[PDB]
Write a protein that binds this ligand. Structure first.
Ligand code: FES
Ligand SMILES: [Mg+2]
Ligand SMILES: [Mg+2]
Ligand SMILES: [Mg+2]
Ligand SMILES: [Mg+2]
Ligand SMILES: [Mg+2]
Ligand SMILES: [Mg+2]
Ligand SMILES: [Mg+2]
Ligand SMILES: [Mg+2]
Ligand SMILES: [Mg+2]
Ligand SMILES: [Mg+2]
Ligand SMILES: [Mg+2]
Ligand SMILES: [Mg+2]
Ligand SMILES: [Mg+2]
Ligand SMILES: [Mg+2]
Ligand SMILES: [Mg+2]
Ligand SMILES: [Mg+2]
Ligand SMILES: [Mg+2]
Ligand SMILES: [Mg+2]
Ligand SMILES: [Mg+2]
Ligand SMILES: [Mg+2]
Ligand SMILES: [Mg+2]
Ligand SMILES: [Mg+2]
Ligand SMILES: [Mg+2]
Ligand SMILES: [Mg+2]
Ligand SMILES: [Mg+2]
Lengths: 94, 122, 162, 94
RNA sequence: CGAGCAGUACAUGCUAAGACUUCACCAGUCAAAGCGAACACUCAAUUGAUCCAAUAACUUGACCAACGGAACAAGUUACCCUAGGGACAGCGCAAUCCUAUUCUAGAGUCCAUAUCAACAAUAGGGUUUACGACCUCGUUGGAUCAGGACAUCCCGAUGGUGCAGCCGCUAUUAAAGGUUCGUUUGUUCAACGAUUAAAGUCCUACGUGAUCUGAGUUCAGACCGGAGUAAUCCAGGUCGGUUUCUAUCUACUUUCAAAUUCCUCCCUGUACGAAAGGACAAGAGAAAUAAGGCCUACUUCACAAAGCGCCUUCCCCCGUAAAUGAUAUCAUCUCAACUUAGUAUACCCACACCCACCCAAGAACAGGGUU
RNA sequence: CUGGUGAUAGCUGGUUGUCCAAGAUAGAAUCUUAGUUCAACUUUAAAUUUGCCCACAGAACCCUCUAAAUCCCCUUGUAAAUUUAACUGUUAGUCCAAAGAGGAACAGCUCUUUGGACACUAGGAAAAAACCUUGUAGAGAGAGUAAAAAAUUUAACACCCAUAGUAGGCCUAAAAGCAGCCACCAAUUAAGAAAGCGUUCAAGCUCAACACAAAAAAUCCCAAACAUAUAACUGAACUCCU
RNA sequence: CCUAUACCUUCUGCAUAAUGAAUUAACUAGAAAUAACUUUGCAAGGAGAGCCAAAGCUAAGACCCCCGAAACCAGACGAGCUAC
């Protein structure tokens, strides 16, 4: 219930997805020492890191392939100018 | 006979009235996709099942990030009825090496680099 | 006719992709309709106006009578007897005849033209000869008339004849 | 009364099926999702020419890992310690 | 619709890269270069393995056409045997057939619509159907007991009629009740005879064979006709001819109890009609059947049972026909408000005498009496 | 009866601990279609390097024209594919969607082709092999969702009036506006040389004119119902959560 | 109260009203070669004559069921029933 409302508020449709209710540790020592991280949280943290690294990997790969294409166009255009420089017309043209 | 479907190129041409409804920008296209499978590959042709595996969409409701390039879009145009496509938004920018462990993909498509799980003081 | 059993996926497609006529916020019949565009007057209507004007101008005695549902043989027989005394029986539609009297000297004859009416006209006011012909049928009433541009009732015609 | 000849949903004379109100709404909900999918596939970030060869190095390196894993298959090492450790089955107290 | 060839060559010689391939294999197909000569034949198919036989070698040999070919073997069995498999009921919006509407051509003197109805169309039902534009052939009556449908054969009510009246015709409504007995004959059905208010159409695993029975499916014998050299065969003709079941389970074992119909008389020889002819409605009296009882007599018979004998038998029906009166100041019976016509009782009831006996009560049990 | 004999049976039936893993539908030949052999598919081991997806480019003229598409296929997304070794097993599959085939057969039957599902899970369509939702497996007295509930009630209606050059000529026993042909004028404020009816034929009439959209079968109908409180909520073995 | 259409076998698909089973105890059904693989020994050699070998050879481990016909043949036994 209320999944559509949560999506409009920037939250997940399932409250168990993320947020304070899920990500926060479930317990801590009475002395005050924080509890060791839960197994589910460690799995999510590793899973999110892999997603984050893929985002960086894909974003840098497109920029590298976009700069490379621009350099080929710059190199190709320069080749046209070089061939016309070494020619001196004569005869009728002079 | 039932065969593969060729989607006309006219379909994938955004109209001026579409940009004011979804908030996209033709002059500054989004760099990455957020593809999420929301439909079962069961009762679908085998070539649609193969593409789902190629896109890493085996598990449903599991967001995956793909590059907004024609070759990848070509596979998306085949299984566009089984997936949900959303642009990846980076209000804080790309994650850094010190932010890899603090990222979180929200349902709005934004990938924040500071996940504190704390109410806004504002 | 949906003879073949459509597939349910196809059947839902037909139901979702159904024509939806646009519905105005306010029904057009409830809005004040625009005034009807004017038309050109009928050539017969303007021909009657010229004919009617001649009747009121040429002859001075006009007798207004109600065209009762007499038999055609009896109604033609009375017309012939009036013709012996040079008394015509003019009939004009009221929808053209009333507006003519609305803008005219004879503006007070308007209530007399209610229902089936007929006009008895003659160059010379032979009132006495006309009354005796009308006395043959007690059910034929003389509503009124206008002699020498003067409005008179049936009683005046009796006094005028005497 | 009310017999359906043959089977219900198959054959020539089938049981009639009718579309409910929420059946239409569910299909419209699916259509709106796919309608927005057509919008995001209309704005590629790079063209066909720019994209070409932008991932050749990574794809070639990724396949060499498959070749390395496939061509490194071999029977495992056999240790003399494992053979001698079976003699502990008869280990007893004095 | 073809093919089981033919014709031109006589280097239609010899060798050899790379490929195709009738979805396997077998088989089949193309081919540069080279030697040797000259200066990969046409043709869609035009074909046959191995073994074996012949021959010095070369090479050749099968309508092996059941054409991946067994060196060489038919018919019949109802005298049949064995191992297995399949099988009234069920699917069928095209064609065809039937029924009811639609169409309004046409019959009916006139006259679409009192009736009837062509080409067709729309619904319901039944049936047929992918190839020899061949011939033939692959469950049903009866007895008992019935259940149900209505698309009603009879009885009832109501419109129309080319309805005077009696009879009829047609349509709406009605399944409460009823729907006979015989002679031949029988893909088991018709014909005929005598009646009846009528001798309904169907469905129910021929409704119903652990209730019964006849025929067929067809048989072990036998002939007649026809077929075959014969064995034997033929939906052909005829004669003869074996299934059984001790009820475990379900269901059921006194709906306690409202009757239908005919004839005669009466009205009446009346209404009607020129007469001939000839009614309704109302009443009465005798009948048959059905249901439920009974033994006074009769009869079969005797402390009794039984019928052939006697007694009793009680509601309505929904189609329509009309008033007042609006939408639509008339009118109009009204899926307008509205008015009228036809729009239940009876039975059963109180219950620790009880051993035992008796009983018109009863399989046991139970029940009634024992004053 | 004994022996050969434990005859043979492509046929029927049966085939005994636990747990996990991979795993379904092209064909050819056959005294063959109840079988077998090969291929395809599947399994295991091994070796090797590309495999799938796919941008252009490219693939016939005919009988005049015409489909969804297919082949090939760099990038790219991906992790498989080929080969070597060793064998076994499976095969008329069924139904649904679509295009067709069978003398030019709308359905149905039979048979091809493409795809899906079923012979593997669960939820929903009433019960439900083939429709829809959904697949990777455990525990929970958590959560968010997917598909997912049939609509429809249909027929009023004109008011008023009509005299006349005439039976317009023709042919017909005579057929007159109204059997038939020709012409289609015309008096009157305004009326068809007649649009329907009825006369052997006439006569009588109305109108034009003038004013004023079905359904019925067999044991017994079949959830109960409800036009009125601001679309959210319910809902899986899918996903999330310990 | 709620939920749940017995098992095996045979077919595309069995709650199937298709096959088998009253139940208990005992008995009752996968036997092997070449090649390949795996693990030792030795090695251009291996093997306790013979045999194989262009890394082979030797040894071991590891794969191939049960019941049921009508029949056919040989040798005996039967006419105390029945046919004559
Ligand atoms: S409701 Fe607006 S015109 Fe009647
Ligand atoms: Mg091949
Ligand atoms: Mg053969
Ligand atoms: Mg052959
Ligand atoms: Mg062949
Ligand atoms: Mg015989
Ligand atoms: Mg009766
Ligand atoms: Mg009836
Ligand atoms: Mg008899
Ligand atoms: Mg007899
Ligand atoms: Mg029986
Ligand atoms: Mg005898
Ligand atoms: Mg039972
Ligand atoms: Mg055996
Ligand atoms: Mg066989
Ligand atoms: Mg598995
Ligand atoms: Mg779980
Ligand atoms: Mg008129
Ligand atoms: Mg839930
Ligand atoms: Mg799961
Ligand atoms: Mg049973
Ligand atoms: Mg069965
Ligand atoms: Mg048994
Ligand atoms: Mg022999
Ligand atoms: Mg033999
Ligand atoms: Mg003897």
């Amino acid at each position: 219930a209320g999944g559509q409302w949560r999506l409009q508020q920037g939250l997940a449709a399932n409250p168990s997805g993320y947020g304070p209710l899920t990500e926060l540790p479930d317990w801590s020592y009475a002395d005050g020492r924080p509890a060791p991280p839960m197994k589910g949280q460690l799995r999510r943290k590793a899973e999110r890191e892999t997603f984050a690294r893929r985002v960086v990997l894909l974003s840098q790969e497109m920029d590298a392939g976009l700069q490379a294409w621009q350099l080929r166009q710059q190199k190709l255009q320069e080749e046209q100018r070089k061939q016309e420089n070494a020619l001196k017309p004569k005869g009728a043209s002079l | 006979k039932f065969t593969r479907s060729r989607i006309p190129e006219k379909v994938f041409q955004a109209s001026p009235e579409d940009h004011e409804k979804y908030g996209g920008d033709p002059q500054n296209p989004h760099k990455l996709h957020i593809v999420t499978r929301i439909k079962s590959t069961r009762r679908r042709p085998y070539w649609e099942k193969d593409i789902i595996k190629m896109l890493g969409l085996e598990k449903a409701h599991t967001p995956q990030v793909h590059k907004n390039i024609p070759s990848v879009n070509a596979k998306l145009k085949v299984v566009k009825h089984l997936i949900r496509i959303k642009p990846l938004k980076l209000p804080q920018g790309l994650p850094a090496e010190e932010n890899m462990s603090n990222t979180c993909l929200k349902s709005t498509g934004e990938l924040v680099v500071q996940w504190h799980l704390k109410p806004v003081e504002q | 006719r949906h003879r073949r059993v459509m597939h349910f996926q196809r059947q839902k497609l037909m139901a979702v992709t159904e024509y939806i006529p646009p519905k105005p916020a306010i029904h057009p019949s409830c809005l004040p309709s625009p005034p009807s565009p004017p038309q050109e007057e009928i050539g017969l209507i303007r021909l009657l106006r010229r004919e009617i004007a001649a009747v009121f101008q040429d002859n001075r005695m006009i007798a207004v009578c109600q065209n009762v549902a007499l038999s055609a043989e009896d109604k033609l027989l009375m017309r012939h007897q009036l013709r012996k005394h040079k008394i015509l029986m003019k009939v004009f539609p009221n929808q053209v005849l009333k507006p003519f009297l609305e803008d005219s000297k004879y503006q007070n004859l308007l209530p007399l033209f209610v229902g089936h009416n007929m006009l008895l006209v003659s160059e010379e006011p032979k009132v006495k000869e006309m009354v005796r012909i009308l006395r043959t049928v007690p059910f034929l009433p003389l509503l009124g008339g206008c002699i020498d541009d003067t409005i008179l009732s049936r009683q005046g015609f009796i006094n005028y004849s005497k | 009364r009310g017999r359906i000849p043959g089977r219900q949903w198959i054959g020539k004379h089938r049981r009639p099926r009718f579309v409910s109100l929420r059946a239409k709404q569910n299909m419209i909900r699916r259509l709106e999702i796919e309608a927005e999918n057509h919008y995001w596939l209309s704005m590629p970030y790079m063209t066909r020419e720019q994209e070409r060869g932008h991932a050749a190095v990574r794809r070639r390196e990724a396949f060499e890992a498959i070749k390395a894993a496939a061509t490194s298959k071999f029977p495992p090492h056999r240790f003399i310690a494992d053979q001698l450790d079976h003699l502990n089955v008869t280990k007893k107290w004095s």
